[PDB]
């Protein structure tokens, strides 16, 4: 038993809700919240900009130190950093950005990072400003993640299309 509430169960291990991931994080305080990161951990907009704003820019300060030490992530890769006031940990995962021409096959590799964590609160990778089809992203999630994932979808209209079209 865990503290996530109001989710629709899609599969044995995947759940979905219309929610603001920032507000969901602050209420649940999950062990892991997933950020829709880029390789530079520049949290300017989308999910990343919202999460970072909710940390009063502490996420960005921590991220800049991480990059200065380690260099950029790989597309499809991830790193674990602090969850600040939102979660114990933040798993920064880089899905491919179609608006940068990155290969969509890397979306499966991105979701594989979730399997290193027993339970996660997460957005749909590569959705939103990353330019992928969220219906495809949900399919890859279901077919790749084996751990327990709670998907927050900000847009109510999108949440309903994802549910109604789910196979
Ligand atoms: C709506 C298209 C892309 N989706 C997001 O950007 C997103 C998802 C979940 N929670 C969020 N909170 C926030 O500000 N944006 C989001």
From Swiss-Prot:
Cellular compartments annotated:
Host endoplasmic reticulum membrane
Q: What does it catalyze?
A: Thiol-dependent hydrolysis of ester, thioester, amide, peptide and isopeptide bonds formed by the C-terminal Gly of ubiquitin (a 76-residue protein attached to proteins as an intracellular targeting signal)
In this protein, which residues make up the domain named Macro?
1-167
Description of how activity is regulated: Inhibited in vitro by GRL-0617.
How would you describe this protein's topology in the membrane?
Multi-pass membrane protein
Per the record, what is the consequence of mutating residue 31 to A?
In strain: Mu/B.1.621
Q: How does it assemble?
A: May form homohexamers. Interacts with N protein.
- What's this protein's function? Responsible for the cleavages located at the N-terminus of the replicase polyprotein. Participates together with nsp4 in the assembly of virally-induced cytoplasmic double-membrane vesicles necessary for viral replication. Antagonizes innate immune induction of type I interferon by blocking the phosphorylation, dimerization and subsequent nuclear translocation of host IRF3. Also prevents host NF-kappa-B signaling. In addition, PL-PRO possesses a deubiquitinating/deISGylating activity and processes both 'Lys-48'- and 'Lys-63'-linked polyubiquitin chains from cellular substrates.
Q: Per its record, how is this protein called by name?
A: Papain-like protease nsp3
- Lineage start: Viruses, Riboviria, Orthornavirae, Pisuviricota, Pisoniviricetes
Q: Which gene encodes it?
A: rep
What stretch of the complete protein does the chain hold? Answer: 1025 to 1191 of 7096
